[PDB]
């Protein structure tokens, strides 16, 4: 077989037992275990699991502190070499050079793979979870000292590599595309005249494209640290989940802006034009696989102020009612259609984050942090593999970039959108609803008429792109 070091000088040698490591009922999958056992598997010498490394580096803070994680992997790296075998002693005692077949097998099959995987955990730690180091300066000094004490011709390759990555992170991403981005489309408003920009004056195709770029960047900016431990729901959410909250807020302001554009267009004929344009934007969103965008529109159409406008929707063409209906159907029966849709599209895409938040939360509130066995308290790692499975899925959709050209002014126009103004949620929400009652009173109150407000043609240019450029 192969003799491991003494469990008295190397803790990571204690044998597996029902009291320190539980496996899931084709590498083994850990259900639970001690921090020591978990770190042993994190850097095992038999197989490999980049998947374990991410799960661990993403969730360990709840069951082990950073300073402690580092001490532990340094101990893990510090493997003691075995004693000369009887054969070797015989040779040495005779003045000849020992073959040391066991020492060499032990270095090749245990030490090499373990030390390398420890360095690997260090590379990833520093490379994608550098925040642990920004918040703890001493932790970083220790990492540097450690990496700097690593002697060896072999290790040299990686030591240098990790040192550079560490410095690159202390000091302060270009994209190449298959084909070229389609030409930016203009309608009534022209380049430079940002004073005219509005829901109907900009080309609907372009509105969907620019919002899709905005929404995609917002999506790709959410880091796993903003999701783990359900921190976006704690009182320090503004500090721990800034990127997430920024993205959710954009979605809200956009849904509200859509609602405002509708209910503030008192004239029925013009409001119908407004609603049609929004449904057309929805159409392009589906095309671009921007589900976040599709839901913002679905949400607006289903809000109290808009939902009740029967006279408006009665005048919407069938092709569009159908588009809106299928879109609405995505969220029915607990997002069944949507989940299926998302699993089948060819990205890039911009998923709806709501689903992930709900699952991550239920997973954190429905699984114990530890599992007790014979008194001993093991770390419930399966709970962690479940949260990481979700953060991984989120990350998978963050890689693929959209091949769309940014239009600085339209982007700016949408970034400064502020439907609510200086009002508070309730006051504004009530305002929109009263407007809805004004433009289309509750039965049997008669339906009034109102003067038009738009001075430009309301005909949409349509959502089919043009070729010239």
């Amino acid at each position: 077989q192969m003799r491991l070091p003494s469990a008295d000088v190397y803790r990571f040698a204690e044998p597996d037992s029902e009291e320190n490591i539980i496996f899931e009922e084709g590498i083994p999958i850990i259900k639970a275990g001690t921090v020591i056992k978990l770190i042993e598997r994190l850097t095992y010498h038999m197989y490999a699991d980049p998947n374990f490394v991410r799960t661990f580096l993403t969730t360990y803070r709840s069951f082990c502190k950073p300073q402690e994680l580092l001490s532990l992997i340094i101990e893990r790296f510090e493997i003691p070499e075995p004693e000369p075998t009887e054969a070797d002693r015989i040779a040495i005692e005779n003045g000849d050079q020992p073959l040391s077949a066991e020492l060499k097998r032990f270095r090749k099959e245990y030490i090499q793979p373990v030390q390398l995987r420890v360095l690997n955990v260090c590379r990833h730690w520093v490379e994608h979870h550098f925040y642990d180091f920004e918040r703890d300066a001493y932790l970083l000094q220790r990492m540097e000292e450690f990496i700097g004490t690593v002697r060896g011709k072999a290790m040299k390759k990686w030591v240098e590599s990790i040192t550079k990555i560490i410095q690159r992170k202390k000091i302060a991403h270009n994209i190449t595309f298959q084909s070229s981005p389609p030409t930016v489309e203009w309608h009534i408003s022209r380049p430079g005249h940002i004073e005219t920009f509005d829901l109907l004056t900009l080309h609907p195709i372009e509105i969907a494209r620019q919002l899709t770029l905005l929404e995609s960047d917002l999506y790709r900016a959410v880091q796993p640290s903003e999701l783990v431990g359900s921190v976006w729901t704690k009182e320090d959410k503004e500090i721990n989940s800034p990127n997430l909250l920024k993205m959710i807020r954009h979605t809200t302001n956009l849904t509200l802006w859509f609602e405002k554009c509708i209910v503030e267009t008192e004239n029925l004929e013009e409001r119908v034009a407004v609603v049609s344009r929004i449904i057309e934007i929805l159409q392009v969103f589906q095309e671009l696989n921007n589900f976040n965008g599709v839901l913002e529109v679905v949400s607006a159409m289903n809000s109290s102020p808009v939902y009740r406008l029967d006279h408006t929707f009665e005048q919407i063409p069938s092709r569009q009612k159908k588009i809106l209906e299928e879109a609405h159907e995505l969220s029915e029966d607990h997002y069944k259609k949507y989940l299926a849709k998302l699993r089948s599209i060819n990205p890039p895409c911009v998923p709806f984050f709501g689903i992930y938040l709900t699952n991550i939360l239920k997973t954190e509130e429905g699984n114990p942090e530890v599992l007790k066995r014979h008194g001993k308290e093991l770390i419930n790692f399966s709970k962690r593999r479940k949260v990481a499975e979700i953060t991984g899925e989120i990350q998978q959709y963050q890689n693929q970039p959209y091949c769309l050209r940014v239009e600085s002014d339209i982007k700016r126009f949408f970034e400064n959108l502020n439907p609510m103004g200086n009002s508070m949620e309730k006051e504004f929400t009530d305002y929109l609803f009263n407007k809805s009652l004004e433009i289309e009173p509750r039965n049997p109150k008669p339906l009034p008429r109102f003067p038009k407000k738009y001075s430009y043609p309301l005909k949409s240019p349509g959502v089919r792109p043009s070729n010239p450029r």
């Binding site: 359900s230 976006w232 849904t255 679905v298 109290s304 939902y307 239920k362 509130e365 429905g366 699984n367």
Partner: protein
Amino acid sequence: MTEYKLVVVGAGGVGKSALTIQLIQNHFVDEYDPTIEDSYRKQVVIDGETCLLDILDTAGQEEYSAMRDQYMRTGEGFLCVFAINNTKSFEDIHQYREQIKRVKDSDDVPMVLVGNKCDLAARTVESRQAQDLARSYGIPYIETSAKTRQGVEDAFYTLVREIRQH
């Protein structure tokens, strides 16, 4: 058989998902995976009649405030939850009730007020306060501890009874 769409509303952190979980999941299994089908349906017998509970839980999505109307509209009954150690969440109830009344376009919407005990912190809302608020709205008041599974079934079953008698 009949299916009741029950919706759990209330500020974030009050323990809405914990309630939903406590009711639907199997409390006698080491692992729970919310990313698995029908983790929202549950067949139960209430007052003899056998029905199917479909719980609409959106915990974690509190921030998507403009998606609220949509989520609510399909509910037939509502659990208005709040934390007993969180006065804010309690003072939030009034508006949650008004939002439900608006989206359902009705003044007689089946609902229950639920005071949940999340942790061992200092209670800051006394049940009398809640009882009185609940009475002014003409609705049932139920205190819970999803953490010890106390009062959970009671809160949902009471809501279903409200629907059956509406």
